[PDB]
Write a protein that binds this ligand. Structure first.
Ligand SMILES: *[C@@H]1O[C@H](CO)[C@@H](O)[C@H](O)[C@H]1NC(C)=O
Ligand SMILES: *[C@@H]1O[C@H](CO)[C@@H](O)[C@H](O)[C@H]1NC(C)=O
Lengths: 56, 50
């Protein structure tokens, strides 16, 4: 429910009625397919909270 | 507000239930169908007694 923007060096996800930068997590994105059929793919990282919060 | 036309039609699909993955994986097919429809418009306006 957003659009992927980039201020030059970091990518984010904002709603398309107001600028609100948020980190690209596994909650505002859904996985569907592989990175070959899409036209316009960009390499980045999807920070998940599970692996960090599991470290104890 | 400037916005790419593929992303524009991808956001236009999120009004009828269809997600963006469909348009982003069949962009060439959608473009070909739209071009074919635009081309057939003139052919089906050619005679068209009514
Ligand atoms: C873009 O935003 C990030 C926020 O993490 C910041 O660290 C970076 O300096 C910003 N870059 C520019 C060019 O504004
Ligand atoms: C993304 O990474 C893959 C392999 O890691 C590479 O083949 C591809 O060219 C990269 N694309 C960009 C835009 O960096």
């Amino acid at each position: 429910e957003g659009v992927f923007v980039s201020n030059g060096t970091h990518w984010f996800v904002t709603q398309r009625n107001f600028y609100e930068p948020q980190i690209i997590t596994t909650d505002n994105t859904f996985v569907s397919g592989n990175c070959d059929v899409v036209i316009g793919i960009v390499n980045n990282t999807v920070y998940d909270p599970l692996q960090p919060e599991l470290d104890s | 507000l400037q916005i790419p036309f593929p992303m524009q039609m991808a956001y236009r699909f999120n009004g009828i239930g269809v997600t963006q993955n469909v348009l982003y994986e069949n962009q060439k097919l959608i473009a070909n169908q739209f071009n074919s429809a635009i081309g057939k418009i003139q052919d089906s306006l050619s005679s068209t007694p009514s």
